[PDB]
Swiss-Prot record:
Protein name: Dual-functional monooxygenase/methyltransferase psoF
Section of the entire sequence shown: 548 to 898 of 905
Family: In the N-terminal section; belongs to the FAD-binding monooxygenase family. In the C-terminal section; belongs to the class I-like SAM-binding methyltransferase superfamily.
Signal peptide span: none
Disruption phenotype: Abolishes the production of pseurotin but leads to the accumulation of demethyl-deepoxy-synerazol.
Domain remarks in the Swiss-Prot or TrEMBL record: PsoF is a unique bifunctional enzyme catalyzing two different types of reactions at completely separate steps of the pseurotin biosynthetic pathway and comprised an unusual combination of two domains, one homologous to a methyltransferase (MT) and another to an FAD-containing monooxygenase (FMO).
Lineage: Eukaryota, Fungi, Dikarya, Ascomycota, Pezizomycotina
Organism: Aspergillus fumigatus (strain ATCC MYA-4609 / CBS 101355 / FGSC A1100 / Af293) (Neosartorya fumigata)
Methyltransferase (MT) domain, as annotated region: 145-326
Function: Dual-functional monooxygenase/methyltransferase; part of the gene cluster that mediates the biosynthesis of pseurotin A, a competitive inhibitor of chitin synthase and an inducer of nerve-cell proliferation. The PKS-NRPS hybrid synthetase psoA is responsible for the biosynthesis of azaspirene, one of the first intermediates having the 1-oxa-7-azaspiro[4,4]-non-2-ene-4,6-dione core of pseurotin, via condensation of one acetyl-CoA, 4 malonyl-CoA, and a L-phenylalanine molecule.
Amino acid sequence: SKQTVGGVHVTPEMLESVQIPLEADKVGMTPAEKSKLVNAATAVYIDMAVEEMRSRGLAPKADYRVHWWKVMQDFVDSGEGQRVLQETNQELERVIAKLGIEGEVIARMGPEIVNILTGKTHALAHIMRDDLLFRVYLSDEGRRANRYMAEYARLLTSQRRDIRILEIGAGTGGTTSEVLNLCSPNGESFCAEYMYTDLSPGFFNAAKTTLKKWESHLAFQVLNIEDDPAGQGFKEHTYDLIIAANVIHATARLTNTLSNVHKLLKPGGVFGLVELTRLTPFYNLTFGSLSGWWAGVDEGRTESPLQSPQQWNSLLKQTGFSGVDLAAYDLPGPERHSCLLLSTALSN
């Protein structure tokens, strides 16, 4: 329309239309094609692990990993495995070689499923080796939604001055990097404040190094979004934009988390929520081995920590937001799996 969010004009078609370079290009694949293949290559390893666990009479360690095992089991036993497979199986390594970072994750994690389940491999240590975990955030499978966020942050900050931005779970700054590269392509100081936050300060040095072009304009402060932001030295209701890319789901109680996001935003401020729209085999492989994926189990998020856009919409309205004002999806069709959701913080 002439739809605005945070006072600037933006539409789903505006963001979703954007074309960006993907590793998939260099192999001549469409993003939907690659995503298909990524999850098909993943399905092979899932199927192999399920059959191996069953053949050897193995059971997982009795912790959150059983939830990972269950999803894998359901994926195979529901015939979903077969379906994904039938759209093949020792161009597998040749396929994987062309799947870039996702292929690397698959190559690293796929053969280790049984080891992780049975406690012979520390999943987090394993996937963090060579900063692979950090690089998966830069992968094709999640870069379009991050670019949507960047594009919206560019729209906002280019059209409005002295915008205050906070990023939750910035991590090693993959989203941050997409944002800065778009909003400040050569150091251009573009907002009143970019507050770079994470649960642990251990990221910050690496972040400062990776983002040295914007060193000064970034502030760095620890923020555990599951706890009250005020107690952690943040000024409530001072932010115009909060960016949270695939972090909000990794919390125990979404309404509590969202309530805390609300505390930081001024009335009318925008919440940029970048989230997976649905569980895919690749995401279960990659993140399901990690304890944080199962943070929502106690409140019924047991297949994964994820919520649909419709669920986020309702949760947002319940926690003082407008709901989803705008959804921009990474892809159309069956392969769609991630999105930008924009929401407005409401005064109450």
